[PDB]
Amino acid sequence: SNKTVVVTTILESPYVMMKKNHEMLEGNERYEGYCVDLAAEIAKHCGFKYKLTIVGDGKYGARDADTKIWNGMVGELVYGKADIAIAPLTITLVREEVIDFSKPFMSLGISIMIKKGTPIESAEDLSKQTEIAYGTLDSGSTKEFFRRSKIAVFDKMWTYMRSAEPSVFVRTTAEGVARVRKSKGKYAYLLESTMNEYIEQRKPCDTMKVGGNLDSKGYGIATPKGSSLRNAVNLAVLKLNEQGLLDKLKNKWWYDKGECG
Amino acid sequence: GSNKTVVVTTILESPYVMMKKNHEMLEGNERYEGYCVDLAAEIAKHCGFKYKLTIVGDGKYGARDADTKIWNGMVGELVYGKADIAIAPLTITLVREEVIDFSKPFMSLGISIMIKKGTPIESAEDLSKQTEIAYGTLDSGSTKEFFRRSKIAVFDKMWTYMRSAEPSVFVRTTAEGVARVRKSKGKYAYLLESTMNEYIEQRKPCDTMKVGGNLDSKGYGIATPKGSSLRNAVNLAVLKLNEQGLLDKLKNKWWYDKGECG
Ligand SMILES: CC1=CN2CCS(=O)(=O)N=C2C(c2ccc(OC3CCCCC3)cc2)=N1
Ligand SMILES: N[C@@H](CCC(=O)O)C(=O)O
Ligand SMILES: N[C@@H](CCC(=O)O)C(=O)O
Ligand SMILES: [Zn+2]
């Protein structure tokens, strides 16, 4: 018997954003963005009503090494606080062991954001110097990439980042971007290419993406194990891709948005 | 029950699976080499099974006959129980995911255009707006189905042309498509996946290239029949191999490291 599906998501541009007039709107209407549009399409194809909820702790999801407790959107699924996560949530092994992911709806890789003119072209460049600090988001997949890497350059970078003072890590993507912008070239931020490429086309047009991506992976829609939504959501992602809807939404929220010419 | 050798279906498609030069003097899995040969050994090791590589009997990827509803190719081998797993450049598609399971993707790709160098085409729109240069796809597979099913104006126009073009613009194998580009003096362009296009661009005689952006974005996945006991282990193994950098290493090994075009 049909119940409203609780969707957990995260305020992250341009995936989910508060509309300019949000104070006078209610419920799902408060929000706009790629994942807001994706949620409406998935719900229509799968035949469910839903409520968008912003993850309580503002995090993507990681497992505490000591307590083994998951936080973020992953934790909301694991502990039964939400039915589905529709967000830029990276498909990773440690997550797929505890939740299920749809096929990917978007490709990405880890990338470098600099303030324009910063003399860095690559991860190797960052690793060979100390004047420019660099770091990642907490409680996400990029931090874990570095923590786990056995590649020489990335291992060196992790050894630096994990002990750097003051802390190079940030609580949100927006904090990382602000830190690049205010640091006069002395901070570079490691973040997913999707977010990097969005910000490069927003005023004040003072950042850019440098070097190749460090890896290749995808975002997926996540459900708790045993969910009755799993198969329908997976097939709906593939239907949306084949209809060209995912490519339409990417153009709508990245390039049609562009403010830097 | 007792542990049983897993039958792997795959397809002779360079550089995924190729006969070794000395294959007549080798046995079993040792007869073959390529990206998917290396990936199968790793999937089997991570999942703890023994396996036998077999080449798909009909040489096809997989499509459902509209009239008989029978699946051919590697998809049919899984559907009908002739193989336990497909480890091949098999595109994840909705109609296939309805009848088999796919792992998470191990390789990204999109449909792309191969030209003979110097052909005056930069895009799908360019192909659609002219008639001097013919163009086609593999005669069975996901690229043909993309065109057949598209509602996008440029692609619909291309399909309307391709489906009625005589003599046939379709080809039986990738190698046939590539040969047709090479011998056609610029008057044939081939629509094929970016992975295969980028491989051939780095092979002698270095006379083709990939032009324009990809027309779509998708992936290849390892496929199992529904209800397979291998499903979860294979899926987690794909994710582990990507995170440990093995997939990017294998792509470099079979595409670029011994590329022949400098
Ligand atoms: C936009 C889009 C749509 N679709 C449709 C569903 S798909 O499953 O066919 N894939 C995709 C896709 C995609 C995303 C990520 C990805 O990661 C791979 C990359 C190589 C190494 C391992 C991880 C592969 C493909 N992107
Ligand atoms: N998409 C990431 C968050 C962003 C990042 O770690 O750079 C995740 O799912 O954890
Ligand atoms: N990978 C495709 C075959 C090649 C193509 O259609 O271009 C499939 O699985 O059908
Ligand atoms: Zn739709």
Residue numbers in the entry:
A (entry chain B): 412 to 527, 641 to 642, 653 to 795
B (entry chain A): 411 to 527, 641 to 642, 653 to 795
The authors write:
Glutamate is the primary excitatory neurotransmitter throughout the central nervous system (CNS). Multiple lines of evidence support activation of the alpha-amino-3-hydroxy-5-methyl-4-isoxazole-propionic acid receptor (AMPA-R) as a promising strategy for the treatment of CNS disorders. As glutamate release in the brain is strictly regulated, AMPA-R potentiators (= AMPA-R positive allosteric modulators) which can promote physiological AMPA-R activation by glutamate have been considered as an alternative approach. Here, we report the pharmacological characteristics of a novel AMPA-R potentiator, TAK-653, which exhibits minimal agonistic properties.
Based on the structure and agonistic-effect relationship studies on this novel chemical series, we designed TAK-653, a dihydropyrazinothiadiazine 2,2-dioxide derivative with cyclohexyl group as bulky terminal substituents to induce steric repulsion at Ser750 in GluA2o; the structural bulkiness of cyclohexyl group is higher than that of the terminal phenyl group of TAK-137, suggesting that TAK-653 may exhibit a lower agonistic effect. TAK-653 bound to the intradimer interface formed by the ligand binding core. The 3D overlay analysis showed that the peripheral cyclohexyl rings of TAK-653 caused steric interference at Ser750 in the channel-closed state of GluA2o LBD (Toyofuku et al., in preparation). [3H]-TAK-653 bound to the intradimer interface formed by the ligand-binding core of AMPA-R subunits in a glutamate-dependent manner. This intradimer interface is known to undergo conformational changes upon glutamate binding. Co-crystallization studies suggested that TAK-653 exhibited glutamate-dependent structural interference at Ser750, located in the intradimer interface of GluA2o with larger steric repulsion in the absence of glutamate. Ser750 in GluA2o LBD corresponds to Ser743 in GluA1i LBD, thus the introduction of an S743A mutation into GluA1i was expected to reduce the steric interference with the peripheral cyclohexyl rings of TAK-653 and to facilitate the binding of TAK-653 to GluA1i especially when glutamate concentration is low. In fact, the maximum responses of TAK-653 in CHO cells expressing S743A GluA1i were higher than those in CHO cells expressing wild-type GluA1i in a Ca2+ influx assay at each concentration of glutamate tested. TAK-653 at 10 μM was highly selective against 97 targets (Ricerca, Taipei, Taiwan); TAK-653 only inhibited lipoxygenase 5-LO enzyme activity with an IC50 value of 5.9 μM. These observations further suggest that TAK-653 selectively binds to AMPA-R in a glutamate-dependent manner due to structural interference at Ser750 in GluA2o LBD (S743A in GluA1i LBD).
